[PDB]
JSON list of C-alpha atoms and ligand atoms in Angstrom, two decimals:
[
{"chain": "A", "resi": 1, "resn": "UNK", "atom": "CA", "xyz": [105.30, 134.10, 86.76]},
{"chain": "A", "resi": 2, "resn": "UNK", "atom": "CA", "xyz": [102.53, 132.38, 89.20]},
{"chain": "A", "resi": 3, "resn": "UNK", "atom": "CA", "xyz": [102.69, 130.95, 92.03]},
{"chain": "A", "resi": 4, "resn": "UNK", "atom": "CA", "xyz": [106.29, 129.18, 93.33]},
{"chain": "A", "resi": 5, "resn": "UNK", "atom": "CA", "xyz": [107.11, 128.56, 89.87]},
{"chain": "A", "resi": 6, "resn": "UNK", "atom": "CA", "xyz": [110.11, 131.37, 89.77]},
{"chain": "A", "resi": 7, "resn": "UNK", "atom": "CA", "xyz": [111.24, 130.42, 92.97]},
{"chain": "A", "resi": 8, "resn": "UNK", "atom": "CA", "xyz": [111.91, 126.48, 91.46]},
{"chain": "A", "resi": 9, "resn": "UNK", "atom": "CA", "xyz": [115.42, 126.10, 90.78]},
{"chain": "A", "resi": 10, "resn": "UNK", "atom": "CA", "xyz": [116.21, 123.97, 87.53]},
{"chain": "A", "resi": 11, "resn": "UNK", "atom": "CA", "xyz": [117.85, 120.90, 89.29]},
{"chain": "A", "resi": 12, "resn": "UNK", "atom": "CA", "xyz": [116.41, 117.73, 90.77]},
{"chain": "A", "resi": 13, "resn": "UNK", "atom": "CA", "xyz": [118.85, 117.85, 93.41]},
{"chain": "A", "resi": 14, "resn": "UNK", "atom": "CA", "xyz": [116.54, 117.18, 96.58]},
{"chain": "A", "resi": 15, "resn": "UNK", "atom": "CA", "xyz": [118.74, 118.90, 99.00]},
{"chain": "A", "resi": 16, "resn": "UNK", "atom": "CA", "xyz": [118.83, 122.09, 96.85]},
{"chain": "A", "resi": 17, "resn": "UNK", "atom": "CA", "xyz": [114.87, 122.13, 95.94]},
{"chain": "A", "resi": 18, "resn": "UNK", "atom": "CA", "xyz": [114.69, 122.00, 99.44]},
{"chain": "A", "resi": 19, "resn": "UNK", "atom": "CA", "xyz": [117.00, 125.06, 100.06]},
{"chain": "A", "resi": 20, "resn": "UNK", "atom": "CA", "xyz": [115.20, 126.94, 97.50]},
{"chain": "A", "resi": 21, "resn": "UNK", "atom": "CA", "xyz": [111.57, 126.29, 98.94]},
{"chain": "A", "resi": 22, "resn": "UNK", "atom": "CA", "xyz": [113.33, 128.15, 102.36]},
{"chain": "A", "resi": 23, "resn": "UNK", "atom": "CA", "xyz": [112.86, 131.26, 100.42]},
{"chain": "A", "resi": 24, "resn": "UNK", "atom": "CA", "xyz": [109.54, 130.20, 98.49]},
{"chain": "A", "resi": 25, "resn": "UNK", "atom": "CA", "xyz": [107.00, 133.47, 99.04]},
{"chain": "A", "resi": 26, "resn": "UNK", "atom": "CA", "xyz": [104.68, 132.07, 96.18]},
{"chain": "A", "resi": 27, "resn": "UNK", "atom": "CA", "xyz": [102.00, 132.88, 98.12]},
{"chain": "A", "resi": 28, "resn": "UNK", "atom": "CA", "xyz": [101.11, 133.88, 101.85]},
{"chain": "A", "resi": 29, "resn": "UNK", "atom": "CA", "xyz": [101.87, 131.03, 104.00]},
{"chain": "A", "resi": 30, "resn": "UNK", "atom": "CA", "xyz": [105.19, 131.42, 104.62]},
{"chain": "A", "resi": 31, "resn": "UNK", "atom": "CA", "xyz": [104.74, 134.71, 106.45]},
{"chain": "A", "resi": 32, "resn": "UNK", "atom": "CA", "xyz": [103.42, 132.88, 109.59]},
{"chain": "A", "resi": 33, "resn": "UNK", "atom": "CA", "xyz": [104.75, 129.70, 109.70]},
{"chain": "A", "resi": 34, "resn": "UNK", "atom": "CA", "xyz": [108.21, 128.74, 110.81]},
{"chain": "A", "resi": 35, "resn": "UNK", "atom": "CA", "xyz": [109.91, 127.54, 108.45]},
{"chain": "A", "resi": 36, "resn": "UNK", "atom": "CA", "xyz": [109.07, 125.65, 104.87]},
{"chain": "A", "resi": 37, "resn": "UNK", "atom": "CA", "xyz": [108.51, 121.76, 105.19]},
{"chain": "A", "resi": 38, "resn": "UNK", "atom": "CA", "xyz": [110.21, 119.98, 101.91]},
{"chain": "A", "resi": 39, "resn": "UNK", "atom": "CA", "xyz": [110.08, 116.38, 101.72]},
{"chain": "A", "resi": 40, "resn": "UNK", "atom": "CA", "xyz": [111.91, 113.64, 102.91]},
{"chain": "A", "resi": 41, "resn": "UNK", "atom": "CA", "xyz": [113.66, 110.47, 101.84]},
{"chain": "A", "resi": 42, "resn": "UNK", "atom": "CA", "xyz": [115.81, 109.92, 98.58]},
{"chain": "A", "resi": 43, "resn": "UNK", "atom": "CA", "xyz": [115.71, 110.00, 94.85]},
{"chain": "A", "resi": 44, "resn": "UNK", "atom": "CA", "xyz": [115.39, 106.23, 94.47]},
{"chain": "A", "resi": 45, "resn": "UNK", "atom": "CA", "xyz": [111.90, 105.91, 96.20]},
{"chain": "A", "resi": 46, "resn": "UNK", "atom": "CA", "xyz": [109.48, 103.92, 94.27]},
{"chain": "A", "resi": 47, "resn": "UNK", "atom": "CA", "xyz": [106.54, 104.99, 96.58]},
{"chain": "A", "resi": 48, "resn": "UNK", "atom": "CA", "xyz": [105.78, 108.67, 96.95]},
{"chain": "A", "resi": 49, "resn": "UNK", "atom": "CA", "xyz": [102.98, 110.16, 99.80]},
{"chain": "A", "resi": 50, "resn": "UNK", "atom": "CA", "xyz": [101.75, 113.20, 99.87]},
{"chain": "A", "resi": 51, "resn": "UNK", "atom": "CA", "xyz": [99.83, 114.59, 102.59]},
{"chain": "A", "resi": 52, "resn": "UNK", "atom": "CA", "xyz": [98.43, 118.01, 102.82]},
{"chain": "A", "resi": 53, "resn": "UNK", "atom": "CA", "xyz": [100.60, 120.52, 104.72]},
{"chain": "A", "resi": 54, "resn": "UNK", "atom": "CA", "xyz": [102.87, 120.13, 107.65]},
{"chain": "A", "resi": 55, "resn": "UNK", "atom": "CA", "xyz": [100.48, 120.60, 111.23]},
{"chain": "A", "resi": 56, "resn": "UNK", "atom": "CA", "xyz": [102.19, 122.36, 114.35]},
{"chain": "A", "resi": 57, "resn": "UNK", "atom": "CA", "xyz": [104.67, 120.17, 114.77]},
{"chain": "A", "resi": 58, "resn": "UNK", "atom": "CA", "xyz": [106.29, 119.34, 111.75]},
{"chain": "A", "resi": 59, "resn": "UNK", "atom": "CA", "xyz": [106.38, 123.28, 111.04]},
{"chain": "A", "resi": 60, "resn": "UNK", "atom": "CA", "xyz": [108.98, 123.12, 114.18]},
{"chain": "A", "resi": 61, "resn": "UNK", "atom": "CA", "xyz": [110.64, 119.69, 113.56]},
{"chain": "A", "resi": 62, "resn": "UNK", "atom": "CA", "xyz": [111.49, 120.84, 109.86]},
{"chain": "A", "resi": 63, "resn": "UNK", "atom": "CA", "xyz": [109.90, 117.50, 108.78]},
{"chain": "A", "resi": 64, "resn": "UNK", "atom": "CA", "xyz": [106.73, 115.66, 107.53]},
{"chain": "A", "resi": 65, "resn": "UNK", "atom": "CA", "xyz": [104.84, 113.09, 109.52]},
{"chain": "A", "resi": 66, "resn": "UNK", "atom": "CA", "xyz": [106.42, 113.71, 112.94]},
{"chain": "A", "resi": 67, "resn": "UNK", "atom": "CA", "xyz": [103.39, 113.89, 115.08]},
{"chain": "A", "resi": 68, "resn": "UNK", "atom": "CA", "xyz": [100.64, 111.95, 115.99]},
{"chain": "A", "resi": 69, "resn": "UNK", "atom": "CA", "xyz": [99.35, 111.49, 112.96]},
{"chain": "A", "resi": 70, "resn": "UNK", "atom": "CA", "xyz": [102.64, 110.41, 111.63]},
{"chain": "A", "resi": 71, "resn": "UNK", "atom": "CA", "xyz": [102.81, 108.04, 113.67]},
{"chain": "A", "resi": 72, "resn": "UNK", "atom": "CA", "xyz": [99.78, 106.30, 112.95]},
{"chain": "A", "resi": 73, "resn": "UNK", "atom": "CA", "xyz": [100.45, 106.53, 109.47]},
{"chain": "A", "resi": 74, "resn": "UNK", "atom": "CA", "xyz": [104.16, 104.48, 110.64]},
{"chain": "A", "resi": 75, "resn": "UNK", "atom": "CA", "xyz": [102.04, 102.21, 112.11]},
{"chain": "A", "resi": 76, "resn": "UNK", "atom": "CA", "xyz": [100.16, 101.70, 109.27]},
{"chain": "A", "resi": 77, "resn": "UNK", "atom": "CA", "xyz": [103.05, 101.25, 107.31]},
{"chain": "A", "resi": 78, "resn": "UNK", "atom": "CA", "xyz": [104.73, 98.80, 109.19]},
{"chain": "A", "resi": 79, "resn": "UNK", "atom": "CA", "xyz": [101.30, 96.60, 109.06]},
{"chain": "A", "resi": 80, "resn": "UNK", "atom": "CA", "xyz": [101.48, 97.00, 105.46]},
{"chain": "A", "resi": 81, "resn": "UNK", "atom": "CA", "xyz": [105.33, 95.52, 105.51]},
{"chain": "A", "resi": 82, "resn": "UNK", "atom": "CA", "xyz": [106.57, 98.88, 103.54]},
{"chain": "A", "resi": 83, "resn": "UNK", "atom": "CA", "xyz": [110.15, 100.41, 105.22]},
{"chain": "A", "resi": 84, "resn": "UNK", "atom": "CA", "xyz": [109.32, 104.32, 105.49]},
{"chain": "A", "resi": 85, "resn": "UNK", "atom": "CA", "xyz": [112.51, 104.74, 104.87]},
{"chain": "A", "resi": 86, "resn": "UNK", "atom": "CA", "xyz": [112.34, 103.78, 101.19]},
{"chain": "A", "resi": 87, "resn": "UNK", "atom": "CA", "xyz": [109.39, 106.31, 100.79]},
{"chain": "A", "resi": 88, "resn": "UNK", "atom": "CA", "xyz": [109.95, 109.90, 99.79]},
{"chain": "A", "resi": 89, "resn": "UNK", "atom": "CA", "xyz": [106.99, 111.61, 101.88]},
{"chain": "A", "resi": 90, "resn": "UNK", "atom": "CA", "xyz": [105.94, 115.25, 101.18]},
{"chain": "A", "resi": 91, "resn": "UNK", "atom": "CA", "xyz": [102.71, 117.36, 101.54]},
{"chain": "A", "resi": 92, "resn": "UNK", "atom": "CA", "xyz": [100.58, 119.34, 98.86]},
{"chain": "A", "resi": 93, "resn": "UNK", "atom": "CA", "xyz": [101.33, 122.90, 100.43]},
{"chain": "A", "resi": 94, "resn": "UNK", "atom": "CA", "xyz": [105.10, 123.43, 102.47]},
{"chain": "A", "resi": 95, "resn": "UNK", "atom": "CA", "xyz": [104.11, 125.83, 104.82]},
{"chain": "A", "resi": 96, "resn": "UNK", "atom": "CA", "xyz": [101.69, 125.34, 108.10]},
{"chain": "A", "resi": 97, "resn": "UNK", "atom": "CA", "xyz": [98.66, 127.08, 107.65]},
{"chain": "A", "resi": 98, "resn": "UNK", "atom": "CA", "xyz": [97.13, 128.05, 111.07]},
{"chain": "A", "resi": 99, "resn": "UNK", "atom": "CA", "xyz": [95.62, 129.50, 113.87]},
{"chain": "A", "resi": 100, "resn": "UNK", "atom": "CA", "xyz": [95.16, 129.21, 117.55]},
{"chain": "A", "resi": 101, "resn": "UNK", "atom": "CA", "xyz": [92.38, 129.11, 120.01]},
{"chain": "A", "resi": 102, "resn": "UNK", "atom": "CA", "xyz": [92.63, 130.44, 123.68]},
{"chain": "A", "resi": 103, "resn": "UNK", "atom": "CA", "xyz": [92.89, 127.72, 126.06]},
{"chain": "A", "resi": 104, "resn": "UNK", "atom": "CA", "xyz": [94.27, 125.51, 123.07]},
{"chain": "A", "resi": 105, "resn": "UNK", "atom": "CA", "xyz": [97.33, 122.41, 123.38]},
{"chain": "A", "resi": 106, "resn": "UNK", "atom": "CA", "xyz": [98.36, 123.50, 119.56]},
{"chain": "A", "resi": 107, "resn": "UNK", "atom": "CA", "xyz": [98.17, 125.40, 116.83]},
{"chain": "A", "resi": 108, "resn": "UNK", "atom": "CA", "xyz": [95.14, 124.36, 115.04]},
{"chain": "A", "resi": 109, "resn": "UNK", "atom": "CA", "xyz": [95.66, 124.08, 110.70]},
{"chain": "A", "resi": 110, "resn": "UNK", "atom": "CA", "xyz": [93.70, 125.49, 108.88]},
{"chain": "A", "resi": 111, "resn": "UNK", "atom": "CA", "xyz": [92.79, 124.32, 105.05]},
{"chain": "A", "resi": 112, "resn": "UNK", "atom": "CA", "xyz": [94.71, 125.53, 102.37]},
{"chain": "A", "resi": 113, "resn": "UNK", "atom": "CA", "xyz": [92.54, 127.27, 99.23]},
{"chain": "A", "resi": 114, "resn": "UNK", "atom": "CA", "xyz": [92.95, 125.69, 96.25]},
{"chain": "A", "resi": 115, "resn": "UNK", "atom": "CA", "xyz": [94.58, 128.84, 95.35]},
{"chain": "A", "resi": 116, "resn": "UNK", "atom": "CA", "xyz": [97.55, 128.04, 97.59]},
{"chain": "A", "resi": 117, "resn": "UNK", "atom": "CA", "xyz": [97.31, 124.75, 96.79]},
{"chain": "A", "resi": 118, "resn": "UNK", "atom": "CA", "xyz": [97.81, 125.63, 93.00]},
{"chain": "A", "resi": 119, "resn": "UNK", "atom": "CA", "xyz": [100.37, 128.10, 93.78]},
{"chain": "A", "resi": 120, "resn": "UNK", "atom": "CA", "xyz": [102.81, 125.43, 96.04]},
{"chain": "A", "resi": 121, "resn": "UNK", "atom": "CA", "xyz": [101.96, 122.52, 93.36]},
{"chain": "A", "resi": 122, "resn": "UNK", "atom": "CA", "xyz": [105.58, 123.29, 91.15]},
{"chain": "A", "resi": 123, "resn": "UNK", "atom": "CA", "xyz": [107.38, 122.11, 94.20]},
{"chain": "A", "resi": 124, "resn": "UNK", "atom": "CA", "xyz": [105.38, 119.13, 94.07]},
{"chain": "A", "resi": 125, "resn": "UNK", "atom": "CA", "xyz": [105.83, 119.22, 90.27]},
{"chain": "A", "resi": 126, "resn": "UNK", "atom": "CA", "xyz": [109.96, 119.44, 91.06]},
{"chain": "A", "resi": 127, "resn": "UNK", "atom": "CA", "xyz": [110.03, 116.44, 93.92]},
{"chain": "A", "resi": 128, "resn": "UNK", "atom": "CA", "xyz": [108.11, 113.99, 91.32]},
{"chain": "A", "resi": 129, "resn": "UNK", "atom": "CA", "xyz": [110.19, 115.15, 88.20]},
{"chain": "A", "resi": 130, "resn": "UNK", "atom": "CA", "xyz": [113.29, 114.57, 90.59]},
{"chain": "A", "resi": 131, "resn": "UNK", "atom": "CA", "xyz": [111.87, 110.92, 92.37]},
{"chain": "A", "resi": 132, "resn": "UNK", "atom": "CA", "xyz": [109.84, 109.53, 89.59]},
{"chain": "A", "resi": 133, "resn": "UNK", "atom": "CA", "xyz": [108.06, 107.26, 91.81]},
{"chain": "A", "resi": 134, "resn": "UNK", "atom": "CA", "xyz": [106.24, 104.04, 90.61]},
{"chain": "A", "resi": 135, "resn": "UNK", "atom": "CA", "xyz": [103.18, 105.26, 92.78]},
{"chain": "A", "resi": 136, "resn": "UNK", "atom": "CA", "xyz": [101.61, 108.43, 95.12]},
{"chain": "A", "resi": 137, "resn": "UNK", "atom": "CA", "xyz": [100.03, 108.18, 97.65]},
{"chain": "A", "resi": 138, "resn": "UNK", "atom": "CA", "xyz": [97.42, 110.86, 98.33]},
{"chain": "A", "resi": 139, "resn": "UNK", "atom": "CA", "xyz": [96.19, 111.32, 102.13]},
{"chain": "A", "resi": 140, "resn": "UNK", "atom": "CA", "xyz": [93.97, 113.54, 102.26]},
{"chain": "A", "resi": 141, "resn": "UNK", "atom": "CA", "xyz": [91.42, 115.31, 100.01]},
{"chain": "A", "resi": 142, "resn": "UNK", "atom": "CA", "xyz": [93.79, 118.09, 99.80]},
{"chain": "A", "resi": 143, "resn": "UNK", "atom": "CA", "xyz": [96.59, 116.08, 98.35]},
{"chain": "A", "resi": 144, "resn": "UNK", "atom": "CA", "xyz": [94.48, 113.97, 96.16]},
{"chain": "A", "resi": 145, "resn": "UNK", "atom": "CA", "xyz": [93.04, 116.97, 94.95]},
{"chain": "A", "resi": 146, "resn": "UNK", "atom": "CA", "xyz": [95.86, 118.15, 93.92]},
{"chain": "A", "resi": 147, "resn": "UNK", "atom": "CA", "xyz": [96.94, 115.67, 91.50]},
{"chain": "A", "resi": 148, "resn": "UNK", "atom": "CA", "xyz": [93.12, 114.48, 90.34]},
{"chain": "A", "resi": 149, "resn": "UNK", "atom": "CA", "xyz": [91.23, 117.69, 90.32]},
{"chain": "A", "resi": 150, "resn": "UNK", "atom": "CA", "xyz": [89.09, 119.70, 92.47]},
{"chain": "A", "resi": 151, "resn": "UNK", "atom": "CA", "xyz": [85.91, 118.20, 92.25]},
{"chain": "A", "resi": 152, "resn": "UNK", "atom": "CA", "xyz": [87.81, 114.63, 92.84]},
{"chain": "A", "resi": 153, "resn": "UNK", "atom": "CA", "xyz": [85.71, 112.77, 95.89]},
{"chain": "A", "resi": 154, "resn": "UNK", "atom": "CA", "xyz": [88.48, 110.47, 98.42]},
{"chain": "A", "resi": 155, "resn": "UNK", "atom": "CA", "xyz": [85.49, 108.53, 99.82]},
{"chain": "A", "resi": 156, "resn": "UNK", "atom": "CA", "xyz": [84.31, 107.66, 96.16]},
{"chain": "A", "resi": 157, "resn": "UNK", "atom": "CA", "xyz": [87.38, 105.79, 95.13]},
{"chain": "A", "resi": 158, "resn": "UNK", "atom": "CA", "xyz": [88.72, 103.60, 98.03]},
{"chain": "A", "resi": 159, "resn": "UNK", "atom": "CA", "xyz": [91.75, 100.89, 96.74]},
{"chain": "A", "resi": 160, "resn": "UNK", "atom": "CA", "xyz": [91.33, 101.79, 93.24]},
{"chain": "A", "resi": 161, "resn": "UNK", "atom": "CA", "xyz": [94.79, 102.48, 91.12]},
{"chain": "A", "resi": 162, "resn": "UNK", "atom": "CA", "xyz": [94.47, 105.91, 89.21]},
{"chain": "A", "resi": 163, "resn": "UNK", "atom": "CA", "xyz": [96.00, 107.69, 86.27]},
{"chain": "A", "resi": 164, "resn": "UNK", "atom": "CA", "xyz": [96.08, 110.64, 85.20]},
{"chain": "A", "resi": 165, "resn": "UNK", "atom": "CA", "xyz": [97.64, 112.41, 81.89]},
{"chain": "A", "resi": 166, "resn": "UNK", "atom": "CA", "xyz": [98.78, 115.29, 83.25]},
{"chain": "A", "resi": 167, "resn": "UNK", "atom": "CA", "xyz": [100.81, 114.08, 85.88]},
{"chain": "A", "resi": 168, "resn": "UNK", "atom": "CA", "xyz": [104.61, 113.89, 85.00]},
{"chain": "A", "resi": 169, "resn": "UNK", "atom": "CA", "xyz": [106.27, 110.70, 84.56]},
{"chain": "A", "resi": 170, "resn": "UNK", "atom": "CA", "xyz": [102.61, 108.56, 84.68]},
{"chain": "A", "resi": 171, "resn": "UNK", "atom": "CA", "xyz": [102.76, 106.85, 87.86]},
{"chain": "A", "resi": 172, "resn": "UNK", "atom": "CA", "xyz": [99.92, 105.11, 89.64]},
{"chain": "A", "resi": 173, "resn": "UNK", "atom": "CA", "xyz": [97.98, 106.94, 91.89]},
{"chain": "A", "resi": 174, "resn": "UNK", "atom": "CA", "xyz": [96.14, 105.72, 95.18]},
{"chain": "A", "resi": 175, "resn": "UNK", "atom": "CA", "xyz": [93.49, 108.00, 96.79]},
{"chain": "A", "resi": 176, "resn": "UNK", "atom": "CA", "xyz": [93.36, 107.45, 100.52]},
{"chain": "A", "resi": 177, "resn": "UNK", "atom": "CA", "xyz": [92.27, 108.71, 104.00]},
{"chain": "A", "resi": 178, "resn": "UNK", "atom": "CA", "xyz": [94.42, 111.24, 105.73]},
{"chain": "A", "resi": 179, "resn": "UNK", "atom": "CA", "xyz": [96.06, 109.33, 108.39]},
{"chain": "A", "resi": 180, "resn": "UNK", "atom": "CA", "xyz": [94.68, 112.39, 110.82]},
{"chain": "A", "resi": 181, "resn": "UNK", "atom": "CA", "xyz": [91.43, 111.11, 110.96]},
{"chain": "A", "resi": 182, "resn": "UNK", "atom": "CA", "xyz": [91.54, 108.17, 112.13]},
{"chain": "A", "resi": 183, "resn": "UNK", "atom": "CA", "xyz": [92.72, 109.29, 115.37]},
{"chain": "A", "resi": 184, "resn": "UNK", "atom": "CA", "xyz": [89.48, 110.33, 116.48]},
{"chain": "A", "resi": 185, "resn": "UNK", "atom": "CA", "xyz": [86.15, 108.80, 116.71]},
{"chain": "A", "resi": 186, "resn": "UNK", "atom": "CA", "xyz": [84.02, 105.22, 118.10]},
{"chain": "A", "resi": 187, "resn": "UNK", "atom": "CA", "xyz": [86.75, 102.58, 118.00]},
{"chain": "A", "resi": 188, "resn": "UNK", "atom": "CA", "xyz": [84.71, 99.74, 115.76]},
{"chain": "A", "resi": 189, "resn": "UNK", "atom": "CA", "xyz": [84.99, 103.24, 113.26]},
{"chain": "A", "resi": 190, "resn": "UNK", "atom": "CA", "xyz": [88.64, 103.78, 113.77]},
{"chain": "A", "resi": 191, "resn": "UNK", "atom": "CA", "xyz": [89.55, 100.16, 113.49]},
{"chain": "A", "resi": 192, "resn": "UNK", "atom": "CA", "xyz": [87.99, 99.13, 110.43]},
{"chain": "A", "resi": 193, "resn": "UNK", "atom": "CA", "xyz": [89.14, 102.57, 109.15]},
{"chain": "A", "resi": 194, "resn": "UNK", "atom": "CA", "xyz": [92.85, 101.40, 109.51]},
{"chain": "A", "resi": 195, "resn": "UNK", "atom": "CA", "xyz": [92.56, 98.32, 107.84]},
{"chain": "A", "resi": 196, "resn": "UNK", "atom": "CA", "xyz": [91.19, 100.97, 105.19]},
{"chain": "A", "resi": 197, "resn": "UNK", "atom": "CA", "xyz": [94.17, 102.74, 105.14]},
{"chain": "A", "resi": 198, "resn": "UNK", "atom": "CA", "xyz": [96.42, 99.35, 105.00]},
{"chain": "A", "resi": 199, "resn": "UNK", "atom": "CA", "xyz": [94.45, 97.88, 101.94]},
{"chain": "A", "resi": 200, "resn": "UNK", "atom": "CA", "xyz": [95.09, 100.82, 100.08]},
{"chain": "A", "resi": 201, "resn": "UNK", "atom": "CA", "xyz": [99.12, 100.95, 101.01]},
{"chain": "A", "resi": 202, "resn": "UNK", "atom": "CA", "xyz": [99.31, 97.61, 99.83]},
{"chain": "A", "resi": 203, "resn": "UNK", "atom": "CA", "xyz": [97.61, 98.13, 96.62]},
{"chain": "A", "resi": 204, "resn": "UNK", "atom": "CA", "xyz": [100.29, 101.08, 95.73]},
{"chain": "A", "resi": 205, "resn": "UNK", "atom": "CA", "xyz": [103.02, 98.83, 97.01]},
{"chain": "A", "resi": 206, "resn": "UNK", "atom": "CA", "xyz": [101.73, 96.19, 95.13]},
{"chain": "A", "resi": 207, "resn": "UNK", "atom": "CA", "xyz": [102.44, 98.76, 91.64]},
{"chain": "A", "resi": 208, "resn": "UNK", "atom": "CA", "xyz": [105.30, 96.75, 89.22]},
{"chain": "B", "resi": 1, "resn": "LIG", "atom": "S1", "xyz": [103.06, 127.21, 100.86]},
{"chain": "B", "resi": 1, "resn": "LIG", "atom": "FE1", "xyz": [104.27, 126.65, 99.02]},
{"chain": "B", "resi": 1, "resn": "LIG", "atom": "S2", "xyz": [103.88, 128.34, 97.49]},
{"chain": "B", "resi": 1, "resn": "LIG", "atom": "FE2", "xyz": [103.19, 129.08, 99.53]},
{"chain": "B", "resi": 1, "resn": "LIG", "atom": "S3", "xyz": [105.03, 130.26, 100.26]},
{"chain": "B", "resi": 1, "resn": "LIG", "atom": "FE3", "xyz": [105.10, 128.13, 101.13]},
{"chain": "B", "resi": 1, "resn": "LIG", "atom": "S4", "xyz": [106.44, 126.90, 99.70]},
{"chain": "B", "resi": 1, "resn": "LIG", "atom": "FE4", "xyz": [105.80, 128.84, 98.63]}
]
């Protein structure tokens, strides 16, 4: 087999894909990290996002979007009047990727290779098969990547509604910033940046 794919269980049961992906060694990442990161929220989400791993601390919390750039991204959620608790929110790769720096606050992530990335993408395969969202969100070049190909360009295709064929169940797709940069930077950048990211979660929320 490649990758995860053995280690998928044949259910869409979220709490048991999420089980199984606790003893996911479909590639190297989960030597050094904690623990695996599934996804959270329920079966009847309509609106999926994908990021593209869990950073230091979601690797300890045991959940996505739990630090600061989490809660930007809430923040940007609530200005785009979606409930985050409707979402199902996930990330391309389930283990934290990482190193650390003497002198460091954190542990600093590292990018997953496409290689991991291809080898974690039947758990992604599973939580879509088992949601069947109208829409994904994809924050991040990693994640968009992952669903659009590897040459696919973020920047190139701000608040535009995407699909693909060979994504299961043909939902829309929308392309966006990773909420983790817009933490940093000038603040006429960062502001206009997260109006950016609000246009674009209103055009997947806007998906019939
Ligand atoms: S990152 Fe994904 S494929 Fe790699 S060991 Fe973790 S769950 Fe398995």
């Amino acid at each position: 087999m490649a990758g995860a794919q053995d280690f998928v269980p044949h259910t869409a049961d979220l709490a048991e894909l999420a089980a199984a992906a606790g003893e996911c060694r479909g590639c190297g990442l989960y030597r050094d990290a904690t623990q695996a990161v599934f996804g959270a929220g329920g079966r009847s989400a309509r609106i999926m996002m994908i990021g593209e791993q869990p950073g230091d601390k979601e690797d300890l919390a045991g959940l996505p979007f739990v630090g600061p750039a989490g809660r930007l991204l809430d923040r940007a959620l609530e200005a785009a009047d979606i409930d985050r608790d409707a979402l199902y929110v996930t990330n391309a790769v389930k283990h934290f990727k990482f190193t650390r720096a003497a002198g460091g606050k954190r542990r600093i992530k590292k990018t997953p290779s496409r290689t991991e990335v291809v080898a974690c993408r039947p758990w992604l395969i599973a939580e879509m098969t088992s949601v069947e969202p109208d829409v994904v969100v994809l924050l991040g070049a990693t994640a968009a990547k992952a669903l659009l190909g590897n040459d696919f360009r973020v920047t190139q295709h701000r608040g535009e509604v995407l699909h693909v064929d060979d994504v299961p169940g043909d939902p829309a797709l929308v392309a966006t910033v990773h909420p983790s940069s817009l933490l940093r930077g000038p603040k006429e950048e960062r502001e206009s940046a997260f109006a950016g990211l609000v246009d674009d979660l209103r055009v997947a929320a806007d998906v019939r």
